[PDB]
């Protein structure tokens, strides 16, 4: 058992474990999104790359939470990981809408844990989220919003042409 | 009071202060244009960058006028700065039309001050405008005209697609 | 309209627009202070430089707020900018007193927005101010206080001599 | 005789010769000022250097006028050079006042030649003065005005101390 734990509530400890699960679920969703866009009948390499990168980012977020759990003397507990919500993800527009919904759900979980930390007077937890998660999440959601607007502008007419152009001229590939 | 002032009319001194106001107003207009194109629901980064760069250029023009005012022994006087004429700027085409109108108004103010300087036999003022402002303004207006033509060619059909292509393939981003 | 806005109150959105106005007003005040010290009948280059640098810093603060407004899905709205409170700024001592008063007013606006963000449970806003504004402001006010003390020590007797020495041996020039 | 002269009036030709005389007279005045401040009983090295540099600058201005006279097919004619107006130049304040008076007289001669060139429709002459003389003269007069203000601030009380400090901390030495 821990000899280090101080000012670290059981409520926070549990919520951190739940948030690890949510990040790993998000990572898995992005893995599925990435490989869908690598299908020969979809074949949008830049979109594939975008989602593969996000799978890595979310895995890293979970690892940072687990590191923090140990630094505070909490105990990591892992649960089953639910499969992603879809097996096929539609168009780039459909996929980017699904990604924004996912990110808003993660952001809300961050905000809820921040509020719990505030209520429990756990400034280390609050700072940790502020420093490593909240701004990263706002920046990502802004980037996704920008992408959504551009995809919408392009597929309004000539959907196929528009989807190709976005992948070629906006996304990294 | 000044021990240096020579051949520097009160009329020119006042007109220079007015021109500083007009440049700072233009800078502010460009700031608003730049941030409008950074909105998540507009999201045209190259257009944002173009107008942000012009905000800087116009601020620098005002600073050069203020430096000159002091070099001649005139006295800088600042007035309120009017907010820009719009809060939302429409499409890239709408924005570039508004920018050309603005630039023509600045160019006319330059020409009017040049004529005043000529009438007052103030060759330093005339040279100063020739050397630092008049050609810069002609070059800018030509660039904006070129852009306008290209945007017009593109949005004639497929307005969304055209606006994206211009931002991606003409503007710096 | 925004597809990204989350946990971002209308009250905060408005207060951020007001704070942009206050920063741009401060920038304008510093521009006037800088050019006053460049007058041939004032001629304190280090003092000019000090205030010109602050005009840039305050403009950059406003730009960071506007960037943040867009990242959160708020809408930038610009108002008229009031001219500075004086047309002539007196001695270096008078100017540095006026600057401290200005900075304390900006600091109070930061603190008030922080308190609003706390009350609205907007940790991203609170963190943003903590990370980019509050410490910068404390450091600046301390520097100005240090300067004020040194100027006071010097102009107690031999005001002209003291003002020259401060400009030459403390300020950057 | 010239095979090249075109659009170059006898009036301009003569006035250019007179202006060469005035520049060489100014150069000679600065030579005397420079060596006065090198006296063992004056001994202000930075002031000496300042005026020696101006003697060179004025000689170079005369050489540029003579080059231009030949480029236009006019004929250089030299007259006697009057000695400087004083044999001893007083304090740094006295000397810098005398220098500003001299420079204003040169500036007025430039402006008068510009007006003659305008009246004679000689744009090459007008451009030549604009490009090589008028702005240089405005910048110099501003620098001298700045110096005068600083010297005045310093010698108001403790004249000896003030004169030393100006030489040590403003002038190049
Ligand atoms: Cl199980
Ligand atoms: Cl007013
Ligand atoms: Cl209004
Ligand atoms: Cl003779």
Report the count of strand segments of chain A.
Answer: 0
**How many domains comprise the coordinates of chain A?**
1
Give the assembly state of these chains: part of a larger assembly
Radius of gyration of chain A: 18 Å
Strand portion of chain A: under 5%
Question: Which architecture of chain A does the CATH hierarchy give at level 2?
Answer: Up-down Bundle
Q: Helical segment tally of chain A?
A: 5
Q: N-to-C SSE series of chain A?
A: HHHHH
Question: Biggest sheet of chain A, in brief?
Answer: none
What structural class do you assign from the helix and strand content of chain A?
mainly alpha
Largest interface, chains and sizes: B-C, 31 and 31 residues
Q: Could you walk me through the main structural features you see in this protein, from its secondary elements to its overall organization?
A:
- The structure is cut from a larger assembly and holds 4 copies of chain A (173 residues).
- Chain A is mostly helical.
- Chain A has a single domain, classed as Ferritin.
- Helix content of chain A is 74%, strand content 0%.
- The first copy, chain A, is built from 5 helices and no strands.
- The longest helix of chain A is centred in the C-terminal third of the chain and has 33 residues, at 123-155.
- Chain A is elongated.
- Chain A starts with 9 loop residues before the first helix and ends with a helix.
- Chains in contact: A-B, A-C, B-C, B-D, C-D.
- The B-D interface holds B 2-4, 6-7, 70-73, 121, 123-124, 126-128, 130 and D 100, 104, 107-108, 111, 114-115, 118, 126, 129-131, 134-135, 138-139, 141-142, 144-145, 148-149.
- Bound molecules: chloride ion (4 copies).
């Amino acid at each position: 058992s821990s000899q280090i734990r101080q000012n670290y509530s059981t409520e926070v400890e549990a919520a951190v474990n739940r948030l690890v699960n949510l990040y790993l679920r998000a990572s898995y969703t992005y893995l599925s999104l990435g490989f869908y866009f690598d299908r020969d009948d979809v074949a949008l390499e830049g979109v594939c790359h975008f989602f593969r990168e996000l799978a890595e980012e979310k895995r890293e977020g979970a690892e940072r939470l687990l590191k923090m759990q140990n630094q505070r003397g909490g105990r990591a507990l892992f649960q089953d990981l639910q499969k992603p919500s879809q097996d096929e993800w539609g168009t780039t527009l459909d996929a980017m809408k699904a990604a924004i919904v996912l990110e808003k759900s993660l952001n809300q979980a961050l905000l809820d844990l921040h509020a719990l930390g505030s209520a429990q007077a756990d400034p280390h937890l609050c700072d940790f989220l502020e420093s490593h998660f909240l701004d990263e999440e706002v920046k990502l959601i802004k980037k996704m919003g920008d992408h959504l607007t551009n995809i919408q502008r392009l597929v309004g007419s000539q959907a196929g042409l528009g989807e190709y152009l976005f992948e070629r001229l906006t996304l990294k590939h």
